[PDB]
Amino acid sequence: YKKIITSESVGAGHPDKICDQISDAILDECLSQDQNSRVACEVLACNRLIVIAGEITTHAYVDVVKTAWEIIKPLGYDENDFTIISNVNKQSVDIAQSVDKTNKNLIGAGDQGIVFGYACDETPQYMPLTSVLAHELLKEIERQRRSKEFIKIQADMKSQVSIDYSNSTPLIETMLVSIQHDEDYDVEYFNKKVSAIMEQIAKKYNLNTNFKKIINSSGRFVIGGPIGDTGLTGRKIIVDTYGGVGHHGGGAFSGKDPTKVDRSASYFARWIAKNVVAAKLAKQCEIQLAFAIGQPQPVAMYVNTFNTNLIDETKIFEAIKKSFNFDIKTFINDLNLWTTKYLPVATYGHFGRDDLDLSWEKLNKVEDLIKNS
Amino acid sequence: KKIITSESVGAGHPDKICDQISDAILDECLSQDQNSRVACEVLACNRLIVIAGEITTHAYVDVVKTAWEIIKPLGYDENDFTIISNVNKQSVDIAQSVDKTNKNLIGAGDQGIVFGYACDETPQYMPLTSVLAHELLKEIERQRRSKEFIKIQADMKSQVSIDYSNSTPLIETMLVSIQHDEDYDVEYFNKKVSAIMEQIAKKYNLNTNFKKIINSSGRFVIGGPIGDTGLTGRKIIVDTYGGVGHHGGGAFSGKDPTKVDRSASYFARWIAKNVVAAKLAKQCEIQLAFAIGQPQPVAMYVNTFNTNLIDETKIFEAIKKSFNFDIKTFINDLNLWTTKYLPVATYGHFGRDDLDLSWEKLNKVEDLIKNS
Amino acid sequence: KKIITSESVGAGHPDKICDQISDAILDECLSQDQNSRVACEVLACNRLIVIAGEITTHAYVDVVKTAWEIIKPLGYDENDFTIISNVNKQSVDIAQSVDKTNKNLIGAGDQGIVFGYACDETPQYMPLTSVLAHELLKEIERQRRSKEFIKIQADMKSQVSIDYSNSTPLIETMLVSIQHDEDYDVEYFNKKVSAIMEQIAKKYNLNTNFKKIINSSGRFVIGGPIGDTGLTGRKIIVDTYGGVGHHGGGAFSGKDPTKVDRSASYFARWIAKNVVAAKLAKQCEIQLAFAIGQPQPVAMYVNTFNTNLIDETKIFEAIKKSFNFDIKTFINDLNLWTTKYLPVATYGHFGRDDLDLSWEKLNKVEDLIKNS
Amino acid sequence: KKIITSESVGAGHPDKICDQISDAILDECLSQDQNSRVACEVLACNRLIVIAGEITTHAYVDVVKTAWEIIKPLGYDENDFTIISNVNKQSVDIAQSVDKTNKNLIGAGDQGIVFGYACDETPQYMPLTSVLAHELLKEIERQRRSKEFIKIQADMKSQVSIDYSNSTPLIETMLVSIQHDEDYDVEYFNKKVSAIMEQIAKKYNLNTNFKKIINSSGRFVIGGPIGDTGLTGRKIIVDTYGGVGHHGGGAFSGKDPTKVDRSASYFARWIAKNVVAAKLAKQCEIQLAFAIGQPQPVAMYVNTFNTNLIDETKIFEAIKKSFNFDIKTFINDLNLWTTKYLPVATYGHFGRDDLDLSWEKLNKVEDLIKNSKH
Ligand SMILES: C[S@@+](CC[C@H](N)C(=O)[O-])C[C@H]1O[C@@H](n2cnc3c(N)ncnc32)[C@H](O)[C@@H]1O
Ligand SMILES: C[S@@+](CC[C@H](N)C(=O)[O-])C[C@H]1O[C@@H](n2cnc3c(N)ncnc32)[C@H](O)[C@@H]1O
Ligand SMILES: C[S@@+](CC[C@H](N)C(=O)[O-])C[C@H]1O[C@@H](n2cnc3c(N)ncnc32)[C@H](O)[C@@H]1O
Numbered sequence A: 001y002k003k004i005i006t007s008e009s010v011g012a013g014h015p016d017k018i019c020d021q022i023s024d025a026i027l028d029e030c031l032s033q034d035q036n037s038r039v040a041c042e043v044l045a046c047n048r049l050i051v052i053a054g055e056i057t058t059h060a061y062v063d064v065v066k067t068a069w070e071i072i073k074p075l076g077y078d079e080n081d082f083t084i085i086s087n088v089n090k091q092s093v094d095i096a097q098s099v100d101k102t103n104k105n106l107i108g109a110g111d112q113g114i115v116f117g118y119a120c121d122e123t124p125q126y127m128p129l130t131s132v133l134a135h136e137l138l139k140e141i142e143r144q145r146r147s148k149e150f151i152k153i154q155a156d157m158k159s160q161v162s163i164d165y166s167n168s169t170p171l172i173e174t175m176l177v178s179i180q181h182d183e184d185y186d187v188e189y190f191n192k193k194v195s196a197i198m199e200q201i202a203k204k205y206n207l208n209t210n211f212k213k214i215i216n217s218s219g220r221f222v223i224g225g226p227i228g229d230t231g232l233t234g235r236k237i238i239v240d241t242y243g244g245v246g247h248h249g250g251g252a253f254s255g256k257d258p259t260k261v262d263r264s265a266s267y268f269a270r271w272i273a274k275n276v277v278a279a280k281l282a283k284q285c286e287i288q289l290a291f292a293i294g295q296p297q298p299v300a301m302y303v304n305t306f307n308t309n310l311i312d313e314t315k316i317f318e319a320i321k322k323s324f325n326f327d328i329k330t331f332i333n334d335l336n337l338w339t340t341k342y343l344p345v346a347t348y349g350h351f352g353r354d355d356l357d358l359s360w361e362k363l364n365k366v367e368d369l370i371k372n373s
Numbered sequence B, C: 001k002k003i004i005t006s007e008s009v010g011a012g013h014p015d016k017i018c019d020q021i022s023d024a025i026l027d028e029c030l031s032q033d034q035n036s037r038v039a040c041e042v043l044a045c046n047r048l049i050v051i052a053g054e055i056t057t058h059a060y061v062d063v064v065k066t067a068w069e070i071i072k073p074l075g076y077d078e079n080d081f082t083i084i085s086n087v088n089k090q091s092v093d094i095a096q097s098v099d100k101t102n103k104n105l106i107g108a109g110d111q112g113i114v115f116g117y118a119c120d121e122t123p124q125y126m127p128l129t130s131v132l133a134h135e136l137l138k139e140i141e142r143q144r145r146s147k148e149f150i151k152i153q154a155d156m157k158s159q160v161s162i163d164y165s166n167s168t169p170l171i172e173t174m175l176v177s178i179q180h181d182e183d184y185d186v187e188y189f190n191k192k193v194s195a196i197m198e199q200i201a202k203k204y205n206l207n208t209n210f211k212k213i214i215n216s217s218g219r220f221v222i223g224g225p226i227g228d229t230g231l232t233g234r235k236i237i238v239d240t241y242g243g244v245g246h247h248g249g250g251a252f253s254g255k256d257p258t259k260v261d262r263s264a265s266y267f268a269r270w271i272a273k274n275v276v277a278a279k280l281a282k283q284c285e286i287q288l289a290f291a292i293g294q295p296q297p298v299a300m301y302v303n304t305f306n307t308n309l310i311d312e313t314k315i316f317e318a319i320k321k322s323f324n325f326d327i328k329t330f331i332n333d334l335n336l337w338t339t340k341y342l343p344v345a346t347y348g349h350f351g352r353d354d355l356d357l358s359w360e361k362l363n364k365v366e367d368l369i370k371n372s
Numbered sequence D: 001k002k003i004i005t006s007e008s009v010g011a012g013h014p015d016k017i018c019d020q021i022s023d024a025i026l027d028e029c030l031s032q033d034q035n036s037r038v039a040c041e042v043l044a045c046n047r048l049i050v051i052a053g054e055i056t057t058h059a060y061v062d063v064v065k066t067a068w069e070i071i072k073p074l075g076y077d078e079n080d081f082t083i084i085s086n087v088n089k090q091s092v093d094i095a096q097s098v099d100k101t102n103k104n105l106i107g108a109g110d111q112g113i114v115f116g117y118a119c120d121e122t123p124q125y126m127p128l129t130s131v132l133a134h135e136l137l138k139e140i141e142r143q144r145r146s147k148e149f150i151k152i153q154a155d156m157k158s159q160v161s162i163d164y165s166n167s168t169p170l171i172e173t174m175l176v177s178i179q180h181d182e183d184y185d186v187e188y189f190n191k192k193v194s195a196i197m198e199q200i201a202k203k204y205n206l207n208t209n210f211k212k213i214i215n216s217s218g219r220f221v222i223g224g225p226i227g228d229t230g231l232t233g234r235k236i237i238v239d240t241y242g243g244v245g246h247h248g249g250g251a252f253s254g255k256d257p258t259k260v261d262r263s264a265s266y267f268a269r270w271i272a273k274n275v276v277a278a279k280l281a282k283q284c285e286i287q288l289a290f291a292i293g294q295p296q297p298v299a300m301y302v303n304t305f306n307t308n309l310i311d312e313t314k315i316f317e318a319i320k321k322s323f324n325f326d327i328k329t330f331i332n333d334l335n336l337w338t339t340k341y342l343p344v345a346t347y348g349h350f351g352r353d354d355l356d357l358s359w360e361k362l363n364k365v366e367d368l369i370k371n372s373k374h
């Protein structure tokens, strides 16, 4: 009765991720010029067409076409490949009055919804091992593509990693990869390259190297990008988060300014959860926050430590409440979300990014949590 | 307090419009051609509806007429939206992998992970938070169309928080935001919603003393895609188990059954639901993983959350002997080529006692019982 | 030498595709609703076809299906173009002006100036340069469809220069550019075109020693909207009199008859053509001007170029007594609500001995003669 | 009674907006890259502006910012239109034909026929009907921007009918339709337009008793692309000679000078205008035809309408000795790579005494005179 858990990732060239990138590149340009921007940018990319839509109210001007090209050119496309449509509508004044309170010391929630923060002790990143390996696999392939160490491949790619959790020590069951390749590729070269990368990633995490490898199970993958499959913003929300190990309330991240609690509260919840595990109050922690549009604080909260709590759950809940300010305006500012760049997190997950220096990944609340328990 | 919260969205919500259109298109295709390959994605923003995705079909679907079928009942007309149709054709590199030469097997439409889930909390075998969230909006929409509830528009959301600290659940909070006319009467509006909140609570034998949050924005006249952009597959948690179950990431609407994101999810719900109805567990969650072109799942995990009535090993073993995991086989077993998907593009795909879905049938309890 | 030149373009030319689609749309509207107001403009550029304009109608036209009717014969398929449909309704401020309270009169759809023209040079009563330019491309397209001329595509142009120094006209130059396949045979292609050039010259009893310019680019494989953008109403001189006659500016395709740019131009051609057929002149040009909402022309000018057989005053006077200048009346006299316009969206709107156009009928010669 | 009529349209007219955007785009391209190949077509309908066409250039033009430059002065804002950009690349099969191996010649960008025209009726050497039609709308637009004429919008048309029965012309009718605000004052509106009609007539020493048609629709509040779709190159007669001259069909806006539809038309106007200013004819019309990839006209015809003051043979002969008909040469002679085209996308491309256009210069009169003597 093996216990096999599986998570996936997608590359920079994947059509859903292109949209996520463009949406966050646009957000970045807005916030860079106007830190009171309201931005809710959604992008569609389908065979020859990229539609840039959403609601924005901003003093900035963003050259939407130039921005799309910044993301698309490194993947291998040129200025004649896509028709670009710009349908940028302003934020609804009925929404704005509710978020931007008369009392300028409070920001009301950008929308209702539910978010989940999650953390665990399985990796240095405090993330499920399946997610971390899935992302690392694709990062390493993309890096080798750009360095030209791995040739005759294109940017569109997916990974799936199954891990065996039956014992105290995890075993990799299966590593799967689909990468878009050139017509004139060499399968032997391609297969040896991927395998070497699969083993290197396993060795780097001190794992077994005897796992089953599924390399390009379709048998052929030359048609790819938005030509092969349509892309949309926010259609990789589980890849963006915790790889199906954690729960998810439904909200997407990319293209959203921090007033959209779907994004800021999720980073806040990860911040809490991650620090809770780093403080060794639990092996795993999941935090659920719910919001109501226009209300400055969460409407409901739940902490779940999965029965891995080292101290009484009551004292964990109580430490969290005394160590964190749950006012939306306050946690936005505490996490420096108005000045953070989001493009780097539009690829390879928003969480456990030891390659980045994200505000919500900092273990700068362990002392307060410890002390308050 | 242990407070768990789920949400729902109405027929007029912009994400749900796109989901409706995507599934209305699928329906037309499959109705004409049951070997259609369909992966329709829709965007709706301000004055624009883009209909895109990959389709290979012998059918012809009048994409504009279809968009209107969905949009007219919400109150829009033929001059409100520019319609763009960008239908691409399924990639031949994908098709060769899915359609094996001998039609004996179908390979998986894509890699990924799906989750089925079921529990004993409701007659629908669904989390109470989800069920209440959906029922709330169904009842508002029904009253809107009957004209019992006036001066409201179709765009709406709900959020239901339930207290699970005790053996008997309590409703903590019911929240509703509904789009209203400029000349609405707030008193009328607030009394109407409250009555509906209590009726939904009474119908599930629940407490009636819960906090009510009604239009916390204070104004909600601009709505629809004018207020907020919509896209297909951006309501995947509302579509499924309201954040109580896990999710592997795949959306449902606009996809033919070769896309295992949809078919395997319905299959997993079918399994999980029958497991709970057979009383082998109070809750069950099944995770299946796929590889593109492979006819069976690549991995499987059953989790009963320590609510198993018999040995977990025997539950896993009963599932394996009671269900055929071949993709082509479970598609046919669930009648997915002939099922209509538009009715599930609103108000969740699971626990629909208002519908007659193949994957909601408790027709596998006997086989599961017998095989343990 | 007096060398006069006119051009034509083929069914596959991008401007003409738009003209075809615009008139195919009009046709569908009028076929269902003869009180349709239609002003359909179309753009076709590399992978995109935008269908726009103002329409008020009880009809429904499947704009995508219609675009395909026009594009399929040229060799395109259902995946070649993104279709955008942006059909806006007719302005109510315009409508009140055109549709008078008094239902006996229709006001002019817009201001502007139109020109009718006719001459005695051809059986069609059209300039010889125009007729030859159009015949050339018709014959190439017919041979393409019959498969007598292979390895060519539908996009093509012609230009015909004629020498008018003497009493008998001489062809100076015939020019043709046709889009060809990559693997075409130039020798075959050149012999084919030449034979067609000579056949067209022989059919009009003309010299056969003219210079031939065949595909002066040297290569013409990229064509259609991929090579060059197309728009409705960008072929107005090819549509009319090949630069021999004047033009006031208004385009024809996509317009219902309330748009005087179209109906008054056909009416002016009708007058002019009958004047020449009555032998009151060898050439005749009629200029009518309109004001929006006014049921009759605001100004009028007849020019017979000093080829008048009787006094000009008596020619003007015969015209006035032989024709009703009320807009509603000449629309009905010419049967414009029930005429099909797609056939005239290619190969000119005038002198179409291949068609049976109301405005080409010599049914006013007796009245003109009698009234002088 | 011999009544000739011409029309004009305003800055806010939907066809003209597209023409403006097309030429504003061209301008940006040429400003950055003088070897640009540009063929930009624009559609504007209801809430949508599509920017399409084929461009090969080292430039980058922010198409959205450019559309706004044109649309903001008319009264629109950044939320009014969905903008689509479908810029395609010039066809390499066309480019090889235009950009000859011999870098000293440019082949014609396309086949076609152009017409230059000039006459002695006005200081601009243009038909009186055209001049009056354009002046009327310029003066309305100027007053709109100065705020002398209020509660009007930029979309507008004019039509001027003139009586040519006698030696001295008479204005028959002046017509104007202007888009107005809902709360306008008709009396104010009618007095304003009339004053402008009379001022324009007096300025050309014409009669002032003509019939005035002012907003014959009775209502014109819905306007712009909302009221009526716009496309590039659907005002080719307003752009040229108001239906007095002939036209071969090609449009001007959005085209670089390799498109002979534009450059050869300016060249033909240049010739014709100088021919009339040299007093060799009262009216002159020049017809040039081209073949794609050929560096010179394929055919040429001068028509003086029997108004030639000297023998026609000597006129034809002077033209040939005074003008170089090589395409590359006349492009350079007219400075077409460095000319701005946005100013001519409104109020006609010809007889613009308000501008300094290369093709309006009477700098070939001396050579024509000199070459037409025995
Ligand atoms: C361009 S911005 C503001 C520009 C000006 N710089 C200012 O200070 O206000 C005004 C509106 O444009 C809309 N908009 C449309 N396209 C846009 C783009 N690419 N970048 C920014 N705003 C855009 C937004 O809705 C925004 O409220
Ligand atoms: C397989 S497609 C999914 C559905 C597709 N929309 C259709 O028409 O069936 C999803 C992903 O597969 C990857 N992909 C595309 N073609 C593939 C192929 N032939 N083999 C393996 N992977 C592929 C791309 O990254 C793409 O995002
Ligand atoms: C729609 S079918 C029509 C022909 C039909 N197979 C017959 O012969 O009876 C042709 C192809 O066009 C594409 N298509 C484009 N737009 C479509 C639409 N609106 N409805 C259906 N298919 C469309 C699909 O990719 C499909 O494979």
Ligand SMILES: C[S@@+](CC[C@H](N)C(=O)[O-])C[C@H]1O[C@@H](n2cnc3c(N)ncnc32)[C@H](O)[C@@H]1O
Residues within 6 Å of the ligand: A038, A039, A040, A055, A056, A090, A091, A092, A094, A095, A110, A111, A293, B013, B014, B015, B155, B156, B157, B177, B217, B218, B219, B220, B221, B222, B223, B224, B227, B228, B229
């Ligand atoms: C709040 S919006 C999302 C963000 C939005 N794109 C923006 O610019 O802020 C999401 C939903 O809220 C609901 N909604 C829109 N306007 C609202 C308002 N003024 N008050 C309450 N709910 C509203 C609609 O169902 C809509 O899909």
Ligand SMILES: C[S@@+](CC[C@H](N)C(=O)[O-])C[C@H]1O[C@@H](n2cnc3c(N)ncnc32)[C@H](O)[C@@H]1O
Residues within 6 Å of the ligand: B064, B078, B079, C055, C056, C057, C058, C059, C060, C061, C062, C063, C085, C087, C088, C089, C090
């Ligand atoms: C579409 S028709 C009536 C269609 C009919 N009720 C049906 O069931 O399909 C009525 C109005 O809608 C607008 N319209 C928008 N798109 C249209 C299309 N493709 N064909 C016809 N009318 C369209 C027109 O302006 C017209 O005045």
Ligand SMILES: C[S@@+](CC[C@H](N)C(=O)[O-])C[C@H]1O[C@@H](n2cnc3c(N)ncnc32)[C@H](O)[C@@H]1O
Residues within 6 Å of the ligand: C013, C014, C015, C155, C156, C157, C177, C215, C216, C217, C218, C219, C220, C221, C222, C223, C224, C227, C228, C229, D037, D038, D039, D054, D055, D089, D090, D091, D093, D094, D097, D109, D110, D292
């Ligand atoms: C030459 S194009 C217009 C110029 C174009 N927009 C540019 O970027 O130069 C006009 C027409 O030429 C014809 N055409 C296209 N390519 C051609 C070629 N290589 N040789 C001759 N004719 C051609 C087609 O009929 C097309 O509509």
Ligand SMILES: C[S@@+](CC[C@H](N)C(=O)[O-])C[C@H]1O[C@@H](n2cnc3c(N)ncnc32)[C@H](O)[C@@H]1O
Residues within 6 Å of the ligand: A079, A080, D055, D056, D057, D058, D059, D060, D061, D062, D063, D087, D088, D089, D090
């Ligand atoms: C942007 S340009 C050249 C930019 C490049 N940095 C260079 O200097 O060569 C390359 C091509 O992009 C296409 N393009 C698409 N949109 C464009 C725009 N707004 N401006 C210029 N070119 C555009 C044109 O076909 C042009 O030839």
Ligand SMILES: C[S@@+](CC[C@H](N)C(=O)[O-])C[C@H]1O[C@@H](n2cnc3c(N)ncnc32)[C@H](O)[C@@H]1O
Residues within 6 Å of the ligand: C037, C038, C039, C054, C055, C090, C091, C093, C094, C097, C109, C110, C292, D013, D014, D015, D155, D156, D157, D177, D217, D219, D220, D221, D222, D223, D224, D227, D228, D229
């Ligand atoms: C009236 S439209 C002609 C065709 C129009 N698409 C239709 O549906 O009938 C042409 C032009 O007239 C002007 N126009 C628009 N609305 C008008 C109105 N109500 N009365 C007079 N002129 C108008 C605008 O300049 C517009 O560019």
Ligand SMILES: [K+]
Residues within 6 Å of the ligand: A229, A230, A231, B039, B041
């Ligand atoms: K997709």
Ligand SMILES: [K+]
Residues within 6 Å of the ligand: C228, C229, C230, D039, D041
């Ligand atoms: K063109």
Ligand SMILES: [K+]
Residues within 6 Å of the ligand: C039, C041, D228, D229, D230
């Ligand atoms: K129009």
Ligand SMILES: [Mg+2]
Residues within 6 Å of the ligand: A111, A112, A113, A250, A251, A262
């Ligand atoms: Mg949300």
Ligand SMILES: [Mg+2]
Residues within 6 Å of the ligand: A016, A230, A231, A232, A235
């Ligand atoms: Mg996707």
Ligand SMILES: [Mg+2]
Residues within 6 Å of the ligand: B015, B229, B230, B231, B234
């Ligand atoms: Mg959404």
Ligand SMILES: [Mg+2]
Residues within 6 Å of the ligand: B111, B112, B113, B248, B249, B250, B251, B261
């Ligand atoms: Mg998926």
Ligand SMILES: [Mg+2]
Residues within 6 Å of the ligand: C014, C015, C228, C229, C230, C231, C234
């Ligand atoms: Mg064209």
Ligand SMILES: [Mg+2]
Residues within 6 Å of the ligand: C110, C111, C112, C249, C250, C261
């Ligand atoms: Mg007109």
Ligand SMILES: [Mg+2]
Residues within 6 Å of the ligand: D014, D015, D228, D229, D230, D231, D234
């Ligand atoms: Mg127009």
Ligand SMILES: [Mg+2]
Residues within 6 Å of the ligand: D110, D111, D112, D113, D249, D250, D261
């Ligand atoms: Mg031309």
